[PDB]
Subunit: 320 residues, 6 copies
Amino acid sequence: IIPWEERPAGCKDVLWRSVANPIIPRDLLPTSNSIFNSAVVPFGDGFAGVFRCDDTSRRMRLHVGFSKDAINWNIKEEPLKFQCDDEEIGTWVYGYDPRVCFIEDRYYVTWCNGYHGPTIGVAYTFDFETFHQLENAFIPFNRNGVLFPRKINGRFAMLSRPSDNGHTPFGDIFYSESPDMEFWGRHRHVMSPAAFEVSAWQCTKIGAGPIPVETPEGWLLIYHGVLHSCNGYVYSFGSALLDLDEPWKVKFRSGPYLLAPREPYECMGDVPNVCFPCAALHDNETGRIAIYYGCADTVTGLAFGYIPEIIEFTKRTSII
Amino acid sequence: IIPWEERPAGCKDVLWRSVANPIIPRDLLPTSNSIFNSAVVPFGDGFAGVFRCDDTSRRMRLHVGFSKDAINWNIKEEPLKFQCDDEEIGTWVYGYDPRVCFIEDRYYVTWCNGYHGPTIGVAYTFDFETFHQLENAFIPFNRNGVLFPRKINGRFAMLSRPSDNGHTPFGDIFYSESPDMEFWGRHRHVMSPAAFEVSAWQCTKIGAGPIPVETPEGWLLIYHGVLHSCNGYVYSFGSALLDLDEPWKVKFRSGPYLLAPREPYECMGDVPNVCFPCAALHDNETGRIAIYYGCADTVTGLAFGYIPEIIEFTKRTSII
Amino acid sequence: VIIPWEERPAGCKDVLWRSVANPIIPRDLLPTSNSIFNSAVVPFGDGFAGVFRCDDTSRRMRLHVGFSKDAINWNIKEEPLKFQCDDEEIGTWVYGYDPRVCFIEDRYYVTWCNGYHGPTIGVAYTFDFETFHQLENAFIPFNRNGVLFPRKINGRFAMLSRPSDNGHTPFGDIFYSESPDMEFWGRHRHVMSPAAFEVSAWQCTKIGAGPIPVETPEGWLLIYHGVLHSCNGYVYSFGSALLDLDEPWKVKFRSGPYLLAPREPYECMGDVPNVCFPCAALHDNETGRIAIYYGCADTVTGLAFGYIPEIIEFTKRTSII
Amino acid sequence: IIPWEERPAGCKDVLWRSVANPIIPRDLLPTSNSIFNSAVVPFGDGFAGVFRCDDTSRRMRLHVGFSKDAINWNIKEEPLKFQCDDEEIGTWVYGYDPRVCFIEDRYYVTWCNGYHGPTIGVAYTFDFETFHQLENAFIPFNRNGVLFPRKINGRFAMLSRPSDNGHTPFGDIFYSESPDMEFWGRHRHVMSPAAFEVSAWQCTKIGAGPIPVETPEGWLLIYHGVLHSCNGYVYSFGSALLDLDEPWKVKFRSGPYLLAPREPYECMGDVPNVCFPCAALHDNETGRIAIYYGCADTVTGLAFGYIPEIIEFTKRTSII
Amino acid sequence: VIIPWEERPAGCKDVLWRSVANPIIPRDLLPTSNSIFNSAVVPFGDGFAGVFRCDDTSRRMRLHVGFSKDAINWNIKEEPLKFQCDDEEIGTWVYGYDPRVCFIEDRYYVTWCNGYHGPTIGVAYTFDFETFHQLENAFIPFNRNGVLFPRKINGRFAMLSRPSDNGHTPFGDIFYSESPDMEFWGRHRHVMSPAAFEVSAWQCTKIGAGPIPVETPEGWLLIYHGVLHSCNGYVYSFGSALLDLDEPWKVKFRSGPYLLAPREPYECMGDVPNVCFPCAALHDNETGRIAIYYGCADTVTGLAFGYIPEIIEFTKRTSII
Amino acid sequence: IIPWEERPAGCKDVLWRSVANPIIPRDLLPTSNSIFNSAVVPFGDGFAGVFRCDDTSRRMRLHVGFSKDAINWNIKEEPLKFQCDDEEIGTWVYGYDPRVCFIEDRYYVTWCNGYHGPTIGVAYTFDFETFHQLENAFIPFNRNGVLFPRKINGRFAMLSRPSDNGHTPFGDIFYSESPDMEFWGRHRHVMSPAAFEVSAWQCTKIGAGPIPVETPEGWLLIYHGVLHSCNGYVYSFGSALLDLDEPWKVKFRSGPYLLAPREPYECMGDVPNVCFPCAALHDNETGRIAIYYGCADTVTGLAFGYIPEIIEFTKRTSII
Ligand SMILES: OC[C@H]1O[C@@H](O)[C@@H](O)[C@@H](O)[C@@H]1O
Ligand SMILES: OC[C@H]1O[C@@H](O)[C@@H](O)[C@@H](O)[C@@H]1O
Ligand SMILES: OC[C@H]1O[C@@H](O)[C@@H](O)[C@@H](O)[C@@H]1O
Ligand SMILES: OC[C@H]1O[C@@H](O)[C@@H](O)[C@@H](O)[C@@H]1O
Ligand SMILES: OC[C@H]1O[C@@H](O)[C@@H](O)[C@@H](O)[C@@H]1O
Ligand SMILES: OC[C@H]1O[C@@H](O)[C@@H](O)[C@@H](O)[C@@H]1O
Ligand SMILES: [K+]
Ligand SMILES: [K+]
Ligand SMILES: [K+]
Ligand SMILES: [K+]
Ligand SMILES: [K+]
Ligand SMILES: [K+]
Ligand SMILES: [K+]
Ligand SMILES: [K+]
């Protein structure tokens, strides 16, 4: 059962923040500087996750966490290490902004992995104890790698985001497929930043956030968008619907954002003015969805909504 | 009858913030994201204005507002539409940072209007219901267009600010005239940013704020200045006195600011560290002035003072 | 008026062809000249007169008057041109470059990029190419490539321009504006933007008006520069468009290919490598002949020739609109 | 019958330019502006090629060409058009810097193909008349795609060069494999630019040139390297030797360049100071190699050398 | 000398901990102060003295003298300090910031970032914190974060510095220099460079010396700032290194983690958000107590406490050397 | 007996190029790529020098050379290596743009030496065979270090040029003194680039060139000046007169240049459009001076003039 808070009285918004935010504090571990941009899945009779925890050396590491209620997290103090037979791909340099999902027979994790620059690291686990590392999916520079939670016409599929070797000032979302979780291709453009005249919260760069959520009306994609002000970037997040069978085809895309930096814990911290969605839990029976997002690259927050309402919002406000 | 709060006990500042700031919140309209950098005038038995209201799509629109007390505003939910006979000029792309004044027999509105980049839009109204759009006054790129509240020597006059098509890293204030509100010329440089050693709150770029205020000795100009820190622009504002007959001739210019970002509503929000004045109401019989400014490009605040004290300060601290 | 002319080289299939005598003006024509380029030329009396940008050996930018019988061999004054002006503020000289000159109604007008707290369009007139009278700068900075039309358009003066910045400007759209009186300007309209690089990359970074627009029955023939940005800098090429006669901000045709791009050593090596920058043209409607003057590598001046009807047919055939 | 000119008397250089350079002029086609970055192979009883011919609109197109002697070229006037079933991949935006080799049963051509940015296009031909387009091999941004001329341990292999969407100011050579010329993976870093103190001609970026040349001692790689002066980039080229079985492992890499911009045809043109090798023809019986290279992004030149000499030079001056 | 102290909180495991009275110096202490931060403090007489960077409401950077009986409650002079100088050129005031003060042998020395055709390191001395005598600037521009050693090193004065540029410097190594006479400087040695980001990203963009080096039996304890560059700006944190006693350009240990990083509202909001910038320390070798003063968000001044032997241990335990 | 070529009849220029330019070809040594920006002095019966020779690896090294006439040089094939008692200072990273003069008892060499960036390296020699390295004079970043040829008031004196660690976009000339060739100080600003309205060949940055030349009226300084065009830097050179006793005080400074890039060997090369003066030889009896300058960072050229004509030109065209 997914975490949930009823929409506040009078609240007109499609998504609403948890009154318990932030749900994960920056100093949960003895050496944590910040814990954000993290992944969460159901597992056993509770929840598991892979967490981005930057330490007091400002190094970026991944940590496994477990939770009974998906809100109060027990995160391992020791960083996760990946088992790999190839010594060269097995070399840890850094890692951030994990996404996790179950595909058919095991859990997969993707992350931004350092291999002569940022690329997409891939690994699996059957038990959230031992993680086995596969080949990096792409050549650098790439980030915001997010798998589909089932095969698409019999292939693995992943969204990604060609980037550069710095604070990237552009970003289109792409789609790729693999028959075997080793060799990737059939690359297709999914979408580009909107024109600032039309939707400026998503006009500098975009990236996939949580694992795509299957609905009868398409893949529900929650994605971040950036606006470039004189004083930096503002990360907000919104919704689109992708075709079921060819998910590089965008059928609707929201004009307004779903969420943008408003609260003190979103506006002040290591990187101000950031809401960055990394994971969602949902229940199709009740339509409920709970969206985890990094706040100011410092802590982790939750927000709630109803899938049918998010669909309706995406279509009614669509800029395509 | 202008809004007013007495100088706080033992306040030695020439301007003091309203203890009720912000006076206009970001969410006054159903889809407003922010409401800031806005224009206000007396109208009838009360007040009217044109407001920059950025929506939840981060689109920039102008909305008409009305108020009985100049503090609590009733802002029309629908964006303002301009009437124009010329189809090319009457095409709306975006609009921001409006200024409004009465000149002779009607109200005039300038704003930053998109026409193949930022330039200065012009329109007039008699009633804040129908707005007749006139020719854009200049070729792009130009912003911070602010009309004088009477003709100067039989011509209309306007301050402007040549710019570029990004977050402009420079900016001098200029002055121009028009016999007819159609053709503009006799362009004169008013002032450049100060040297950083002399006055750094105004060393990167400057721009006119509220409508110039006539005094016996010249025009009181309240204007924004930017300081470029390692972590962004800080917008503060200050005062100058221009020659009455030839307003490009600056007589005094404040070394110190009048106001700079200090409170959490000025320091945190969509664009941190911004105090951007765009309107003032004044009463020559009492010397009272009330200055409306954008706060963090998020909300609108008010600050109060006396014109003769501001003039005395501007002279006594003059950097010229 | 006998305009300079060389017949198309045998075998040559280009719309324009360079003079075999290029460069026609060398960099060291005056005792202190560093470079002479980006200049203006008109018929005057039984020969030709012009206003020339001559940068000196201090690399200051100045305008000099010149006269020629044949429009090829120029006698340029050693001393810079000075403008008369009753307004001291406007009449203050900081610098000036890239002049254009045309006759409108009753006198010659000069526009140039004039320094007034940055680049703007300076404006003057002369009756005799001896005394020059300065008028208001037409626009607020930053603006350059101000080019007048050679008659009024529906009862108003008209000028092309090009909003810029205070550096090596990395953008540039051509605009059109009007004036009833050569003092106040307005009714600004956008003419064109750089093309997409996948469509026409010689003109994808920025563009600007060159020579005075040439009136044809088919519209105004605009000869204009375009910039391509390589890893090693800007390349300036030039090409042709056709503007509506009555509303010259409406572009009717615009060439895909350039007309001329830097090729010769005098275009590719010099103070600013890889520049062909058209500044003036002489034409003869009787014969269709046109002779186009252009700055070469910001160092010397060259001439190219073509036929107006061929230029027009090329612009149409290859139009990217 | 590969083209050849013997070392000049006295000449101590490992490579020497053809006395006939440039061997392809800029104006060979009726609307060619330049012909420079071009791929040549033995075909039938002569030679065939795909040529980058930028036109007088400065569009980048590829053209097929044929020659008896590999020197005097007859290049088709109309650009090459690819057959493709898939309309999305099949859409032409631009194309440059082709490379061509025979693999097993057909000729393959790669090039820098526009697909929402630069990536590596792939195609094949049996006859150099009709070309059939395959999937782009990678997600943007990537350039300098160069196939190996046989499979490596039963997979197709390709060198590439992760880039950005501008004049890329960085660049490592990578190595990737495919079982089927559709799905790519097992990406491995081959080499980075050198330290400027060590070898400044190759210290900004590098990229593969001609098709790797199999020697008993490994793959001979001819590659470009960039130096950044105050007035622009200078492209020179040099040699390395890659392990035969695992060609991302570099065995030797030359300190000095083989060739750098010196002649007027290399130092004056559309892009000054460029020698950009693009193809080679060689003879294992004689040890001779003829290297085709772009000059100033304007014309095509040829240089000659001996493979074992190049190898010994690569070893003796190795910076690894 | 009784230095300020607060005992570490119940179960706080950190090596340094903030004063519960932070900020100890507010932004509006003086009638025209905009901010007061990045300041220098020392024992003097039977209390304490300092030189404070107080930026005014014109955002000019000036230095003011202050005094305190307890080093927490400060009386800062309203009027900026003025230096007396033999040489009128060197004695010309343009601006000054980021003061450091220490006693060397027989007097107090002040260094600051002094404007002389760009930022450099000004030097002056005082016996009384009333009259200051300015000496030659120690280096040619561009340089800042000049910090003297509190005694001579093998008979010469010694200074850490930080070569810079004329803007928001995006790089920075700490250097070490010597002088026999407080006039001529030389024997320059590189001390350390920013860390690789994969190793220690709080100090990967640039570094600079903070308080005056603190002599320990295990080396000079250097407390220094590091910058990390995020998409939205620079974050300044600070940490610790140990330098060889005899040759202080040789770094023996260097911390992986920071000691302190912007966390509280007064460090994360203000004129420059996300800055903790250490400027001075007071210490007592008998108790091992150290009190470190640091600018917060370039707006106010804060204090943090620790123990010298715990910092030494932290530095060695986490060393990235 | 210094080299000399009479000013051509009719020639009105203050300096004129040797008709034998370039006097040093880029390929004089077996591994040289370029030879420019080099230092020359009288020695014994002829002349000696220290030459910047960049090799075919594009490494920057100094080499010693000798000549009978100062025109035809025999340059040692192997780079100059310094003796140094301190291993930290004695470590060679790179070196360029040497200057050489005799002071009191020996020859001193300054160059731009890499020590955690560019700074001014110092060495002496009695014989041009053995060179003894001294302390680097300054902390990085600094270049264009040029000694005075005698003590000034009992101290060694040096011009320098504060810089950054790239292609430096600014540059003022400074003056410093030393009692002992070990500790430096008394730093004084000499001059800054001119405003571009006034003298644009020297508006971006300047730096000192050859060793200053003592005259009755002051030190004659020949110095380079940069203009920044849209396509790069142009290096020209000119002249100033400094006070004899306090050489940071500038008495006269030329408006026009003396020499600017004009010939193919100045305008085409590794770095186009560079004339970079590094040395001079002069004869007070005749007023003859011969100036050595680098040409396009490729080859070395010579130019001639008369000291009294240079002095009169400098005073007559002075911008001070
Ligand atoms: O700093 C803001 C953001 O920057 C980008 O690099 C992301 O991929 C996130 O990891 C982060 O939240
Ligand atoms: O973002 C801060 C400021 O930016 C500029 O573009 C202004 O003209 C304002 O609209 C604004 O307040
Ligand atoms: O330098 C190249 C070109 O630069 C621009 O500024 C033009 O307006 C011309 O003056 C010049 O030819
Ligand atoms: O402009 C010079 C070079 O630029 C790069 O983009 C290369 O890939 C080449 O196409 C070209 O030769
Ligand atoms: O603004 C952050 C920091 O910037 C640099 O210039 C420092 O030397 C400090 O003055 C300041 O705290
Ligand atoms: O490249 C042009 C010039 O660049 C600078 O770094 C100089 O100090 C010279 O070495 C050189 O001639
Ligand atoms: K799509
Ligand atoms: K003025
Ligand atoms: K906003
Ligand atoms: K148009
Ligand atoms: K490798
Ligand atoms: K080309
Ligand atoms: K060290
Ligand atoms: K001076």
